[PDB]
Amino acid sequence: VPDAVDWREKGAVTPVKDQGACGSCWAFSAVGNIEGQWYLAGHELVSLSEQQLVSCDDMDNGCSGGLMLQAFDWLLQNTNGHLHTEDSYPYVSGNGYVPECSNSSELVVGAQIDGHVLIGSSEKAMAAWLAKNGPIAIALDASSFMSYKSGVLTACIGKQLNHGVLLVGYDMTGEVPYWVIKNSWGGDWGEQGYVRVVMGVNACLLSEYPVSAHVR
Numbered sequence: 001v002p003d004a005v006d007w008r009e010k011g012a013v014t015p016v017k018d019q020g021a022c023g024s025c026w027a028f029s030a031v032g033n034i035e036g037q038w039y040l041a042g043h044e045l046v047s048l049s050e051q052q053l054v055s056c057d058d059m060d061n062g063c064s065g066g067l068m069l070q071a072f073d074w075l076l077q078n079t080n081g082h083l084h085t086e087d088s089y090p091y092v093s094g095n096g097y098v099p100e101c102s103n104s105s106e107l108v109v110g111a112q113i114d115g116h117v118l119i120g121s122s123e124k125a126m127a128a129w130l131a132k133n134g135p136i137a138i139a140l141d142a143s144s145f146m147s148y149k150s151g152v153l154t155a156c157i158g159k160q161l162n163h164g165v166l167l168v169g170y171d172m173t174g175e176v177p178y179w180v181i182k183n184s185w186g187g188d189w190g191e192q193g194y195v196r197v198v199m200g201v202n203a204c205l206l207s208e209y210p211v212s213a214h215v216r
């Protein structure tokens, strides 16, 4: 069990994105995880398309919510696991409206998944899984994120799962051990788009729904 893991420094995390007023956290969470699994399977890091899921995934509900596992299922059942690049299928739902799904010939496939896993809902198991396998898509209570600016959150409201984000690392070398979370509220929010949360107390209910795609 390493004292610290940072998948950002290891090259597995793309720049921070901004979901805007759309309830598409589920798509940002899922895509961020896919980006990491894709890189860790030996491919070049590439930013992938949340918009494809928001507009095309009919198991989920666009700007009205979704679930990361359902997003993976939609890809597996409808595109043979293929996801387009962000550059070719950019995010346009920041104002809450969802355009029709595109099948333009200018779309470029950026990645392919072949399965998914639901990781045991235990913080200690998540840390071991993340240390070996990469960033985890999680659900949590983000109520305490509304006022967060910087530092390690040691008091998180843990009442209701109301957001989805990406767990990119942890560090246990200081007095307060912490997880590092990539949010989808733009690079000006929090610590250049990230938040740190204490480990070992199920802070923010972060161990309730840890999931990942699988890449060959």
Ligand SMILES: CC(C)C[C@H](NC(=O)c1cc(C(C)(C)C)nn1C)C(=O)N(C)N(C)C#N
Binding pocket: 022, 023, 024, 025, 026, 059, 060, 061, 064, 065, 066, 067, 068, 070, 138, 139, 140, 161, 162, 163, 164, 209
């Ligand atoms: C992981 C989970 C907590 C994410 C959460 N999921 C929902 O809210 C949700 C899912 C569904 C169906 C029934 C699956 C279609 N319907 N709603 C309203 C979500 O999407 N959040 C918090 N958004 C808005 C972000 N942004």
Ligand code: NA
Binding pocket: 149, 187, 188, 189, 190, 191, 192, 193
């Ligand atoms: Na900031």
